[PDB]
Structures are given as structure tokens and as C-alpha cells.
Design a protein around this ligand. Sequence first.
Ligand SMILES: [Cl-]
Ligand code: NA
Ligand code: NA
Length: 265
Amino acid sequence: SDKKTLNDNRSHHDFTAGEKINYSIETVVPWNIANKKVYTITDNPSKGLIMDADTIQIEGLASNKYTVKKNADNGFTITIPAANLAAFAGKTLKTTVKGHLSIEDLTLIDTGIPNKATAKVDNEAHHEVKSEEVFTGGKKFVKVDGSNQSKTLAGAQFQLVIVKNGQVVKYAHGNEKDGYTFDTNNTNVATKTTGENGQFEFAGLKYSESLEAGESYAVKEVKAPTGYDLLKDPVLFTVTKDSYKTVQAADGQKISNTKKGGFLP
Ligand SMILES: [Cl-]
Ligand code: NA
Ligand code: NA
């Protein structure tokens, strides 16, 4: 029978926004396909998952034998003239495709997001199939005064970075919608600014347990709040299942700041 499989050989299925997720779709081609008109596969990803229509491949069928259309739900439709499947009569057709997470709604962080697909022969649909769920996480922070942790601070800017062996080794670029990339380029870095409530966050990150050996997430201050000294060192944090969705923003990880002297104008 039909199947859609997440190809991910881990016990946890956490991804960073933008990271490629591999799927395979297997669909039955009926014995009588040659006497039909059309074979359709429709992919309907759950909200938060985008399918990459340019990544579709069908085993044993060339790209000039079918049509791919991108759809408004971020899925796609494959249309195959039934004649082109005559040699697959009674067999399983195997499609591979990639997708990625793009979060436009923050209520989707720490929720399971499945892919779904349905094959149809002429007007007769098969049962919809669903893959395993993927997840993405995040972390919430509050910028406070070191000597009065009730006092939240505006105007702090923080970059997302990775640390290892006592050094910043990678800088994040992008965001939870557009996707993140991490590399050694310390420009165009993913950055957040605090308002008067001191709040900021980074969402759409895989769990810390999925990072390379020895690596940690950290936030690096690059602009201090007014009246405060720029922190010397990054601040480490951990992303785990439900680390984002189970705290209100005001209860984020507190980051302490120390007051500084002024200058003469
Ligand atoms: Cl911001
Ligand atoms: Na298929
Ligand atoms: Na999925």
C-alpha cells in the first residue's frame, strides 16, 4: 500500500528552520494503468513545512514524462499521463523529495509537523498517507540589570552564534521564516533587539543534543542597553523539547548586565 517516509535515522526528529528534510513517497501503480488517463500525486504539507518542488525525483521515470506544479499550500502536484506508466503496471512507484521548515506562526514551535500525500488514478483517490512528524525548538531570553534582576532593559542587541572550545566558531544568518545558515562569516548576523520589556528570542532551532560534538548555542551581545557595559563573553543556552512553548516571554532566561560610566559630550 502507499507510504510516505521521513528518512531520518535518529530517535528525535528536530530540525532547524531551512534545514533539508528527506522524504520518500511510495505509491501503487494499478495493473490496469494503461487503460486510464492520468496518475496524480498531491503533496499537502502541514503548516510550517514547505516542500521543495525542484527536488522531486521519481525512480525509473525521466523528468520529461511528468509535470510538477507548485501549489498554494506549499505542496505540489505531480501529473503523469497514464501511458507513461505502462511499464510500472502492478508495481510501486518511488518518489523522493526534500522539504524544510519555515515558521510564519510561532505557535508551531515545539509542535509535530507531518507531511501528507495522496495518489489518485483518474478520479479515484487512494487513502492519504502521512510521514512521521518533525519538530523545531527555540529559546526565550530577558535582558535585565545584574544588581536588580526585576529591571528589564531596552536597546540591547544580541547575535545567535555557536561556540566550541572556548571560541565563537559559527555565526547564524537568517531567521525562522527564511531559514538559518551557520558559517564562519561574522557579517549579516541574525540579531535581535530588546524593547522596554527586555524580551527577545530565537525560534526555529534544532535541539542542542543534535549539534556537533562540543558545540553549544550562545547569544553574543553586540550593543549594550543605555547606561550599561557591553558583555565580554557570549551567553550559553540549551534548546530541548518544549523549551520554547512552555515559558511566557517574560520568564525567558535572564541575562545580567552591569552599569557603566558615561562620557562627556
Ligand atoms: Cl528584533
Ligand atoms: Na511515488
Ligand atoms: Na514531517
